[PDB]
């Protein structure tokens, strides 16, 4: 048992029921035949920090689910700081997006911070800002969906018994964690958080839109994933900051 | 042209629909006969800092419209720093609670912030560990969604949060109240607070949501 997404797993839309259930008024358009480009940023190995072991077969998972759901991934193994910055810079730049764009950053970071390869702090912020209609014309208008699988500070989640547009518009970054809480791997199976998105997107992104999909997610790791370490039982809560103005589906199809 | 909420302006479900309607596995429950408590704090006079004029007008309609929907309303208006934690720890305290909590802050801050009357910043996540199932037992379990009106097996314990975070009566107060009112009976607060995205944008919010399902008002006959 060392969970690995399929393509056999994935369920899929036809035309018929998006053209039925489409709404502009309420939902985002996402029909491009390649659905749009997938940024993700993987990084492993650090200077003055652990190895970031098993954060491959979430890459790969991850390649394999967003490529099944008919998207252009592109990879960016250890980057720096300066270079996360960079490349999600050029990625806004990519006149070849479709309907919607990705963005998948694994890496080791704090609260509002992404550390970089070099070990060099990221604001998230300043990442957020990249993907703007601002600063991302080729953008404005088309939902961004960004992943981010990384720590946001050291606490330990113990848990308990059982026109115009506003500038930030049309983003939402799904994170493995909350706050100022620590995000969970393992050498083993892989990112409790990765896994959950393959299984869940595998099953409902053809009925249900992101935010259904990630609150699946949060209830996956929620009430599924535990861990534990002389002290505590370990619990971990991920959790979606949306600035989305529409329903958000991925409409998977014939295009994996 | 100055939105104020009104009683008729609510859309209401009856008993039989929530009946038909609710799966355990896929909503919270939220059926208290009083649904729960709702803590308004509203900050409007500061001592280095600004007025904020008009807070007057959304405290009521945020009032009106959560007890329309069939919550006990608290008000405490202009706290300091310490002022704010105390309340909302006790607020946590109340054990008079419901299926499900609400908490609006409507003051002077930026993002990770909420400044007191007294000029004092407050950790906006200081705030919500006071919510957690950690420190608020009595909401263990329960949804609770806080509206922050800033200007400018086991569970988690953070668990069961959604965070309506506006940045700078309002655009978005009364937005909420508008869209609430004739979609809380049929819409989960996600979407309903998705609306309110819309209607501000085409007419930044954002939602930051720690839910494991969906939450309905359900609104009745408790106005």
Redesign the interface.
Same mark, same amino acid.
């Given at each position: 048992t060392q969970y690995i997404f399929h393509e056999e797993d994935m369920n899929f839309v036809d035309a018929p029921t998006i053209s039925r259930v489409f709404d502009e008024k309420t939902m985002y358009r996402n029909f491009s035949s390649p659905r749009g480009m997938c940024l993700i940023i993987n990084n492993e190995h650090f200077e003055q920090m652990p190895t970031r072991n098993g954060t491959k077969a979430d890459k790969d998972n991850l390649t394999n689910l967003f490529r099944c759901m008919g998207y252009t991934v592109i990879c960016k193994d250890n980057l720096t700081g300066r270079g996360m910055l960079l490349t999600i810079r050029d990625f806004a730049k990519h006149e070849s997006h479709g309907d919607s764009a990705i963005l998948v950053i694994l890496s080791h970071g704090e609260e509002?911070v992404i550390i970089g390869v070099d070990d060099i702090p990221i604001s998230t912020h300043e990442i957020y800002d990249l993907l703007n209609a601002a600063n991302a014309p080729r953008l404005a208008n088309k939902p961004k969906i960004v992943f981010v699988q990384a720590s946001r500070g050291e606490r330990r989640?113990?848990?308990? /018994?059982? +026109?115009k !547009?506003? %500038?930030?518009?049309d983003i939402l970054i799904a994170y493995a964690t &909350?706050?100022?809480?620590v995000s969970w791997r393992n050498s083993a199976r892989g990112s409790w958080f990765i896994q959950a998105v393959c299984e869940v997107f595998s099953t409902h992104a053809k009925d249900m839109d992101v935010? @259904?999909l990630? &609150?699946e997610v949060? !209830?996956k790791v929620?009430?599924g994933f *535990?861990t534990s370490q002389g002290s505590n039982?370990l !619990? *971990?809560? /991920? @959790?979606? &900051? %949306? +600035? #989305? #103005?529409?329903?958000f589906y991925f409409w998977p199809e014939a295009r994996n």
């Open positions: 509002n989640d113990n848990g308990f /018994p059982v +026109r !547009k506003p %500038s930030q518009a &909350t706050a100022q809480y935010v @259904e990630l &609150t949060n !209830k929620a009430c *535990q039982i !619990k *971990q809560m /991920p @959790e979606m &900051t %949306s +600035r #989305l #103005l529409k329903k």
